[PDB]
Design a protein around this ligand. Structure first.
Ligand SMILES: OC[C@H]1CNC[C@@H](O)[C@@H]1O
Length: 444
């Protein structure tokens, strides 16, 4: 038996562009993911979010699935361009109506909404003005967040400014693999910095408009282990954790500067008086969300940009090719308490992509995902037993969905989606998870 604390929040998680479809319905502006995915060569098989899970129409039935499974919390995101089609100024009532219906439905059914304000679908109109590269985004984001607080803050009380700002900056602006598809290290570190300033401005306005709410921010994290016991490899691990995990943002938020190895690597790329912004960046937050999926063996490498290479290990992997290292989720939970001691933590995403097939029996026997969830939920329980203030756990994802540059080819859902009909098939992992929420923990 591994029983969780009373009132622990068991959730599922999605993101607007990944499930909704109908990106231009009802006066919505284009996002950068619309223009990106519509550019030939950017996404596997030419996939886009034009249709996705058609959640824009099937939202009621999807929530009914959440209800039926008994899960207590739904993490979802809001499409900025549905609300403010030009990014600032005009507010689209029909966009607000879409999310209002979802919000009211969840509450009526006793599910707690956790709203991610920004999960990567910037209004295209703002990208034309530089997007995350432009310092003024801290004002645009504040205006947007304010609108969400004023319209939804009466009912939604749990808020997340940004999903995975490292990915937004580095994958979007350095690697060019995600929208807006840029490859410029100077832009990428300006985007890191503006992400922090916009997050801090949003939190500030939240204090003014939602008196009884809680607000946090979500980071991606990997469990990095050194290839050798040599000095340089252990250091390569120390760089990667500081750059790729929560310290890149939490060192600023809690200590008022970037982490030390990040400055060794990137001080030429950061804005010249970046320190002037640090005091405002330290705006107090209520919780930290950590996402976790995978671990990576890393070693020093003199030929690699950043002086780090990944080394492949003979370990069980998901369809992403990601190494399954359950103890990473425990390590990261431990480490976040050790380093910054946030008053609350949530696992805001954890999950796995496997090649799911509908059997002849009409069921999806994803024993491989059950095994994955069970192992990590076990490690999260362990972290709680050693004092980490973990208040919730969210499976990525409710639904198989548009997996960014991988398109529909990667399935993360505990519910299978047959894209040809839009049929939902609860997976074995979904029934299994439904049982652990009912029991408030593991059993065998
Ligand atoms: O890569 C799987 C998931 C990682 N975290 C952010 C999500 O949008 C993504 O689908």
């Amino acid at each position: 038996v591994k029983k969780f604390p009373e009132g622990f929040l068991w959730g599922v998680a999605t993101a607007s562009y990944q499930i909704e479809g109908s990106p231009l319905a009802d006066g919505a502006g284009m996002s950068i993911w619309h223009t990106f995915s519509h550019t030939p060569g950017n996404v596997k098989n030419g996939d886009t979010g034009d249709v996705a899970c058609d959640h824009y129409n099937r939202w009621k039935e999807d929530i009914e699935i959440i209800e039926k499974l008994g899960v207590k919390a739904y993490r979802f995101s809001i499409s900025w361009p549905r609300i403010l089609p030009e990014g600032t100024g005009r507010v689209n009532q029909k966009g607000l109506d879409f999310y209002n219906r979802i919000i009211d439905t969840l509450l009526e059914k006793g599910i707690t909404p956790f709203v991610t304000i920004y999960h990567w679908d910037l209004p295209f109109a703002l990208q034309l003005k530089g997007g995350w590269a432009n310092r003024e985004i801290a004002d645009w984001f504040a205006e947007y967040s304010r609108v969400l607080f004023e319209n939804f803050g009466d009912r939604v009380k749990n808020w997340i400014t940004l999903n995975e700002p490292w990915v937004v900056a580095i994958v979007g602006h350095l690697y060019g693999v995600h929208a807006p598809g840029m490859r410029d290290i100077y832009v990428a570190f300006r985007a890191v910095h503006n992400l922090l300033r916009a997050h801090a401005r949003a939190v500030k306005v939240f204090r003014e408009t939602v008196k009884d709410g809680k607000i946090g921010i979500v980071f991606n994290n990997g469990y990095f282990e050194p290839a050798s016991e040599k000095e340089e490899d252990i250091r390569a691990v120390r760089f990667m954790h500081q750059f790729n995990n929560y310290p890149l943002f939490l060192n600023p938020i809690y200590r008022g500067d970037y982490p030390e190895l990040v400055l060794e690597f990137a001080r030429e790329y950061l804005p010249e008086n970046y320190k002037d912004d640090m005091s405002e960046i330290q705006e107090k937050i209520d919780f930290v969300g950590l996402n976790y999926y995978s671990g990576h063996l890393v070693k020093f490498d003199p030929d690699a940009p950043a002086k780090v290479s990944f080394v492949e290990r003979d370990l069980p992997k998901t369809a992403m090719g990601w190494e399954i290292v359950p103890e990473g989720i425990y390590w990261i939970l431990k480490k976040v308490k050790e380093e910054y001691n946030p008053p609350e933590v949530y696992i805001t995403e954890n999950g796995a992509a496997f090649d799911d097939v509908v059997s002849e029996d009409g069921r999806v026997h994803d024993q491989n995902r059950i095994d994955y969830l069970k192992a990590h939920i076990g490690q999260a329980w362990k972290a709680i037993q050693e004092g980490v203030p973990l208040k919730g756990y969210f499976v990525w994802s409710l639904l198989d969905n548009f997996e960014w540059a991988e398109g529909y080819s990667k399935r993360f859902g505990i519910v299978y989606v047959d894209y040809s009909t839009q049929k939902r098939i609860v997976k074995d992992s979904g029934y299994w998870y439904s049982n652990v929420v009912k029991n408030n923990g593991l059993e065998d």
